[PDB]
Design a protein around this ligand. Structure first.
Ligand code: FAD
Ligand code: FAD
Lengths: 383, 380
């Protein structure tokens, strides 16, 4: 079977015991004392800068409005990825509506990009659940045969304007389908010459390093430089609840928060060693995570090597201390939702759980009981 | 029983079938409609001149100290030690200890004020059993019953209210069976503090109320009944869609929940001899309707309003006190850390951010006062 070894490794990791997943990640995430000392200084600076000085999550109601509101931050060195809000389509008519939303957005974003390309100019992010009715329930063969022509058509428009098109990561049980779709698109000759295809991998998932191995190898055999957004993950609370009801003895996600942090750093090390064939995009609002990757990546940098990413309404204060020659001189792409209350609910719940959780960096930075010492501590050394 | 059969039969009764009996009961006379429109306009005009926000204190001692100001203004309290959906035996044990310690503190603070003038407590059954939603009902009740009875006995000892909050629709039957056992338990005789929430967004609501009113009358317990719309609507919809069902256990149009609430309020106001109705709402039109439906006769203990801490103060400052409507309001007061706050806080966000919610529409420039005072019966 093609890629038998890489695919078997993903499947074997799906619900592997958490204690067995961690040792290789801890080793891969271990950095030198010299690097850890330098990163602690950077993280302290970022946090000292930070601790001083629903509509909040949405950039605009239409793509035209969102694009207009993006000019100020683009002038400062930020880029954008626009998300037409909407997911989990329940009818064919809803899936067709979302498809048309994305199509119209690509034309508008492509015009605004004006030839800036996939790294300096804006792109789009899509959710597969918006494009197939009952995405979570229908057999993969039926989902594939109807979804693939739709995603290909959107990818062709993005190619035509030379903008990025990212497939967002959703629930753990749709990782396999989405990855199979990524493979088919990356091997499709009609998309040749365009490196804008992107894909998210969630470091809270046990399969993350093995999915990355598959994607890096896919980049090598397809000739596409795949954009890879490394995230921790947005669905943790729902995944725990679903696994409990499913009767599982071992879950598809980690259950200790610092294990996700270690997983993220280990996976960043793998991505940073493969920048010839992937474009790593480090999505995080955690200043300690950011500092660790900034130092892991070393002194040599150019635009197009890698970037950081943040969510609209959450990451701007931190990344104002990152973008720009006087700061860390590293770019950041803002994930920019577009829509109204009618399409905001699912995304907003995930933001509430992210912002309100006692374990989240964005909560802890405002917690008087959490010292700066603890905020800059390297989680890898805790394990 | 016949009353319990009506509850089970209504579980997923088609929505269009549920409405005609509610529309009739929620229909008010023109004089009452006109008075309610006048009161509601006055309340809304005062309003339009106006997660730490949702927590009264980290501990029960802190929350009690902060309650003195509003208690002398005419408010009362129901304290909620945050916590729900226990996943382990250790978690359910910890929540039990929190509820137990809260009852001792609240009961000592009550100092003989009784169940209407003095503070009470609210509990969630899902906090007290480690597999509350995922285990067999008869077994869940058989382990939950001694725990809830022990808490009820403490509440009786101090003569305070103890309310069972309502949670997911698939747990209504279990919790109702628990209420019946407690109300027939001779060890709790002479105490009228047992309370129970019924959710008007549920199709079973009027039949649950019939069962509870009859249970109160035959048991001699003046059951405190908190009538709410409901806090879990988005979750019930998502579960019912995944379940492949065509008919859900909740209404799908917000106006139907509003009509259901008014119809159920009418049923409760006709039964104040045997139940203590507690009208929990932040909607000034809903409040004004119930205020006039209740009539001119009032005494402390007949009924009360209720609100959530951090949400209801602007409205109820126009209600409590002799310069206002002279009706009491009990504040639901969450107590706990940010850790235990998360699920409650999310529900507060689905409630406050929803375009259909009164608390959002009150600030929405596109929504007229004329629309806010519309009578749901006349709009459905
Ligand atoms: C631009 C951008 C795009 C994103 N796209 C996606 C996407 O397509 N799909 C997606 O799923 N996520 C996505 N995310 C990630 C998600 O939305 C959160 O923003 C992210 O997980 C928060 O991580 P952090 O490093 O900012 O914060 P931190 O506070 O460091 O980490 C918080 C994270 O830890 C994890 N976590 C919390 N508790 C536990 C626990 N007990 N055990 C194990 N893990 C735990 C969760 O992943 C949580 O979000 C994206 C994030 C950004 C910034
Ligand atoms: C003191 C207090 C205690 C409470 N205790 C509980 C409890 O134990 N259990 C519980 O479940 N709830 C409880 N609630 C209710 C819940 O938390 C909300 O506060 C309440 O439902 C809001 O109703 P309202 O009259 O203030 O607002 P409104 O804006 O008038 O009504 C909003 C409500 O309408 C309903 N709704 C919204 N959209 C739709 C729709 N499309 N179709 C059908 N219905 C819809 C929902 O129930 C929503 O909450 C309590 C409320 C208070 C004030």
């Amino acid at each position: 079977r093609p890629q038998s070894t890489l695919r078997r490794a993903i499947t074997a990791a799906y619900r592997r015991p958490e204690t067995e997943c961690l040792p290789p990640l801890v080793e891969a995430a271990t950095q030198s004392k010299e690097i850890r000392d330098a990163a602690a200084s950077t993280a302290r600076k970022l946090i000292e800068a930070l601790r001083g000085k629903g509509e909040q999550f949405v950039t605009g109601e239409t793509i035209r409005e969102a694009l207009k509101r993006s000019k100020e931050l683009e002038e400062k060195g930020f880029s954008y990825s626009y998300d037409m809000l909407g997911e989990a389509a329940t009818t064919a008519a809803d899936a067709e509506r979302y498809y048309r939303d994305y199509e119209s957005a690509i034309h508008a974003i492509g015009k605004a990009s004006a030839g800036r390309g996939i790294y300096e100019g804006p792109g789009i992010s899509i959710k597969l659940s918006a494009l197939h009715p009952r995405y979570s329930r229908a057999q993969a063969a039926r989902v594939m045969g109807e979804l693939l022509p739709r995603v290909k058509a959107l990818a062709l428009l993005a190619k035509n304007y030379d903008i990025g098109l990212n497939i967002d990561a959703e629930e753990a049980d749709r990782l396999e389908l989405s990855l199979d779709l990524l493979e088919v698109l990356c091997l499709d000759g009609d998309l040749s010459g365009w490196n804008g295809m992107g894909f998210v991998v969630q470091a809270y998932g046990k399969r993350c390093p093995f999915v990355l191995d598959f994607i890096i190898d896919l980049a090598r055999r397809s000739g596409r430089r795949i954009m890879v957004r490394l995230v921790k993950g947005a669905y943790w609370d729902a995944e725990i609840k679903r696994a409990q009801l499913d009767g599982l003895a071992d879950f598809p996600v980690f259950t200790r928060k610092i294990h996700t942090d270690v997983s993220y750093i280990a996976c960043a090390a793998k991505l940073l060693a493969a920048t010839d064939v992937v474009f790593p995009q480090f999505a995080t609002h955690n200043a300690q995570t950011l500092a660790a990757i900034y130092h892991m990546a070393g002194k040599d940098f150019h635009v197009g090597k890698y970037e950081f990413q943040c969510l609209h309404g959450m990451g701007e204060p931190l990344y104002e201390e990152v973008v720009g020659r006087g700061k860390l001189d590293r770019p950041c792409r803002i994930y920019a939702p577009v829509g109204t209350h009618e399409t905001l609910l699912a995304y907003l719940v995930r933001r509430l759980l992210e912002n309100g959780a006692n374990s989240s960096f964005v909560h802890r930075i405002n917690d008087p009981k959490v010292s700066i010492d603890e905020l800059i501590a390297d989680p890898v050394e805790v394990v």
